[PDB]
Short mmCIF file of C-alpha atoms (C1' of nucleotides) in Angstrom, two decimals:
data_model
loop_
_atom_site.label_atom_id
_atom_site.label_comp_id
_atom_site.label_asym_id
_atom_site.label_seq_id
_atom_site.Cartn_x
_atom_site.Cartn_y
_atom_site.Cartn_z
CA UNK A 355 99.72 -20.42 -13.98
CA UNK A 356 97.08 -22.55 -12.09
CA UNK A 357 98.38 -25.78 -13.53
CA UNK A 358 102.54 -24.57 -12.83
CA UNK A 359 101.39 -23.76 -9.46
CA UNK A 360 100.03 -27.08 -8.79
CA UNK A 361 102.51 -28.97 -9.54
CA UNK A 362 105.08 -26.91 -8.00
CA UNK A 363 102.78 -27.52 -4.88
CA UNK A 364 103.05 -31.10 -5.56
CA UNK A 365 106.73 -32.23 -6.95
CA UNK A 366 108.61 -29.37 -5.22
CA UNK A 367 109.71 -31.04 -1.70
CA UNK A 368 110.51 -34.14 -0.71
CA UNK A 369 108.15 -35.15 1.99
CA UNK A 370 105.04 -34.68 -0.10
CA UNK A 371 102.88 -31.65 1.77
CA UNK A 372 98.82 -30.98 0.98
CA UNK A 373 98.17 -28.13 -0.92
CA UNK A 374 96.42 -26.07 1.66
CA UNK A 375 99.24 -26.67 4.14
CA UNK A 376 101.65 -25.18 1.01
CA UNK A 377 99.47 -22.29 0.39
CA UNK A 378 99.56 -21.40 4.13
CA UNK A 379 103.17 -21.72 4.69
CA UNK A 380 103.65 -19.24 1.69
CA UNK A 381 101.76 -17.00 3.24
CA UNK A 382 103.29 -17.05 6.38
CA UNK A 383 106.44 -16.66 4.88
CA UNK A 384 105.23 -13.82 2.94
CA UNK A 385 103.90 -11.99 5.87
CA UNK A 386 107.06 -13.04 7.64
CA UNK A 387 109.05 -11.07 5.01
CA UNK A 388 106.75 -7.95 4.90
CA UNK A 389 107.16 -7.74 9.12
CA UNK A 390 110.82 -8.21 8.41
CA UNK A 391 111.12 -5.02 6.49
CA UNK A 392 108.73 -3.09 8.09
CA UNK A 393 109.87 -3.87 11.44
CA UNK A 394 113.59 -4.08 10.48
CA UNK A 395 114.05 -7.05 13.00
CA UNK A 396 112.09 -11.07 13.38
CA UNK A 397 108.46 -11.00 14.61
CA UNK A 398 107.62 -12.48 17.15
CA UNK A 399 105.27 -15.82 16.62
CA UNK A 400 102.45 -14.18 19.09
CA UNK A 401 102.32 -11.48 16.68
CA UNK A 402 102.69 -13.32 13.41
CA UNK A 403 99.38 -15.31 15.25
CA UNK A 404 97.61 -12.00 15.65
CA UNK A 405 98.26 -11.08 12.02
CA UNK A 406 97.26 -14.36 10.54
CA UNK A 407 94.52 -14.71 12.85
CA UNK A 408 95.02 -18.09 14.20
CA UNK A 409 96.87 -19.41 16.99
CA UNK A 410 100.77 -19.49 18.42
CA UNK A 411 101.07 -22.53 18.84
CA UNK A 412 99.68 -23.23 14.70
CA UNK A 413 102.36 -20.79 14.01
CA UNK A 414 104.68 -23.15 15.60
CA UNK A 415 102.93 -26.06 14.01
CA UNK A 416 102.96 -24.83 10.52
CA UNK A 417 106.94 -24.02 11.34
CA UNK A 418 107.93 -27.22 12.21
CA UNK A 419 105.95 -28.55 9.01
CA UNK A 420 107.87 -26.13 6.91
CA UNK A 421 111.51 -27.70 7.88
CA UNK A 422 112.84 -29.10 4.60
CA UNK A 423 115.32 -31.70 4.93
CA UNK A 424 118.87 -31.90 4.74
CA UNK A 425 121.01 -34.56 2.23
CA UNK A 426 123.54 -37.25 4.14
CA UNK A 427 125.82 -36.76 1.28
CA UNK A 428 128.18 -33.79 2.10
CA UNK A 429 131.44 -33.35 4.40
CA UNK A 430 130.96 -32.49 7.68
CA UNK A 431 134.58 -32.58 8.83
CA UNK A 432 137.39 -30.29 7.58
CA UNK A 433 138.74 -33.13 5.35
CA UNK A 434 136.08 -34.56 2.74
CA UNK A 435 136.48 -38.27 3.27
CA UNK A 436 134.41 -37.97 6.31
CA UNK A 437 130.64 -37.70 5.07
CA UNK A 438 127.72 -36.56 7.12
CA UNK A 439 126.21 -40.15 7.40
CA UNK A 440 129.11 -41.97 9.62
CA UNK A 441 128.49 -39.73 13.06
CA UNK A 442 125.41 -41.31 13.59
CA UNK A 443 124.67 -43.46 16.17
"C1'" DC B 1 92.54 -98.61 69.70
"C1'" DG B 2 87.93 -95.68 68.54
"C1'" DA B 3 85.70 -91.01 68.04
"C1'" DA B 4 85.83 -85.70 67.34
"C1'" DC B 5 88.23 -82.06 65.29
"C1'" DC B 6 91.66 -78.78 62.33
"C1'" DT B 7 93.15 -77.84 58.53
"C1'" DG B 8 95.28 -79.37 53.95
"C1'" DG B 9 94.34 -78.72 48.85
"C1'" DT B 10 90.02 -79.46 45.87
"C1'" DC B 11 86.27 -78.24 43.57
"C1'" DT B 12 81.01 -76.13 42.41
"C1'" DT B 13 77.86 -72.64 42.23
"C1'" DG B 14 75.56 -68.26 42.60
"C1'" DA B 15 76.05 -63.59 42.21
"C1'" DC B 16 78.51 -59.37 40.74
"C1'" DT B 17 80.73 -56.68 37.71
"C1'" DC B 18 83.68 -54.74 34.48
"C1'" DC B 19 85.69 -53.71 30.46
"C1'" DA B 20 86.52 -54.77 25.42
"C1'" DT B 21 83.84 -54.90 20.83
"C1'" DT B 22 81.13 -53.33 17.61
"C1'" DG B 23 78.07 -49.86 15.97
"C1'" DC B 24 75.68 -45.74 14.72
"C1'" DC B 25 75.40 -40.94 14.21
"C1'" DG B 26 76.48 -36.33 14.10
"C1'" DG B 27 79.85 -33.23 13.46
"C1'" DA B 28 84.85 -31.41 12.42
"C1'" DT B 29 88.85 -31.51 9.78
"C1'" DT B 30 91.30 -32.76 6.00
"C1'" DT B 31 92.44 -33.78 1.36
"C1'" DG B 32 91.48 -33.67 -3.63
"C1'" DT B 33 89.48 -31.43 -8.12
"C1'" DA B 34 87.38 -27.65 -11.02
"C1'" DT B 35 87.34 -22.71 -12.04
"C1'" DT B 36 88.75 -17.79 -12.41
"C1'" DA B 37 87.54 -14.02 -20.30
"C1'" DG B 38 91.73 -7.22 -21.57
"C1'" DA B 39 96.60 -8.65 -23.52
"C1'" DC B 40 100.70 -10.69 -22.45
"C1'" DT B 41 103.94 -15.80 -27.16
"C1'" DG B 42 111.67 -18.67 -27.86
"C1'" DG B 43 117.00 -18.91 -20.86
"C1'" DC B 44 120.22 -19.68 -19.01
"C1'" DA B 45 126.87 -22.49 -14.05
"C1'" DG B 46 130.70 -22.66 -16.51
"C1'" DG B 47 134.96 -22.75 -16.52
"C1'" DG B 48 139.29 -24.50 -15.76
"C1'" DT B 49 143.06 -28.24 -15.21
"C1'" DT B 50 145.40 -32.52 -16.47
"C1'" DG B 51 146.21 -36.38 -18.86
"C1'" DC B 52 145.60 -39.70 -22.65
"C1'" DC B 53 143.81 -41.51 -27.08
"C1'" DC B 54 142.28 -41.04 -32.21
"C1'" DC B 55 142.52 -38.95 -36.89
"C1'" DG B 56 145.05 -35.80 -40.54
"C1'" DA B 57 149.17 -33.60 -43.10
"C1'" DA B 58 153.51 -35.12 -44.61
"C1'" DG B 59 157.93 -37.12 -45.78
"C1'" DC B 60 158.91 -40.68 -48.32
"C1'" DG B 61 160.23 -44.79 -50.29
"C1'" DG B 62 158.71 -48.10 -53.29
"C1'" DG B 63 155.83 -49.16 -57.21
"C1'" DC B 64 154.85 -46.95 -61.68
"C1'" DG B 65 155.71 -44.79 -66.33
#
DNA sequence: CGAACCTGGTCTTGACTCCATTGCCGGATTTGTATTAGACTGGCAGGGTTGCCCCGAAGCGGGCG
């Protein structure tokens, strides 16, 4: 399990991400999901600080390092010959 | 026509001074590896549609008897 872990924490994403900064974003999305269904609705980040005992604007940090990205290589547009790639400027 | 002066770039020197360039050191943070002893031992997209090409039974006609 240590060795599946690891690599998981390794090969999993795209943009390669340290392992401490994976271990921390799965456990703020673990104790995002346990607020969730306790408090039936989204915490808010100053709380989410309080319970992981660091800082808003980490929590915000740590969110914006979480963003996986998205593929150029679907249709935006009703009709598939339009791909996501040609409305960029 | 001769002397004194004003002001043109022209250029040196002495002093100031100011900010980049390393450089060391101490600490903070950040990333990478090793370790956790009850027992645990073979999974899941997925099919459906359409069209075309390649091999097998089968008449079957010609060689065979």
């Amino acid at each position: 399990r240590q060795a599946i872990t690891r690599a998981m924490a390794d090969q999993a994403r795209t943009i390669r991400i340290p392992v401490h900064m994976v271990e921390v974003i799965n456990k703020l999305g673990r104790i995002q999901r346990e607020l969730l269904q306790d408090l039936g609705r989204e915490p808010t980040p100053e709380e989410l600080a309080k319970e992981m005992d660091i800082t808003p604007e980490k929590v915000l940090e740590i969110q914006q390092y979480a963003r996986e990205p998205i593929s150029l290589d679907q249709t935006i547009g009703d009709e598939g010959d339009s791909q996501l790639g040609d409305f960029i400027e």
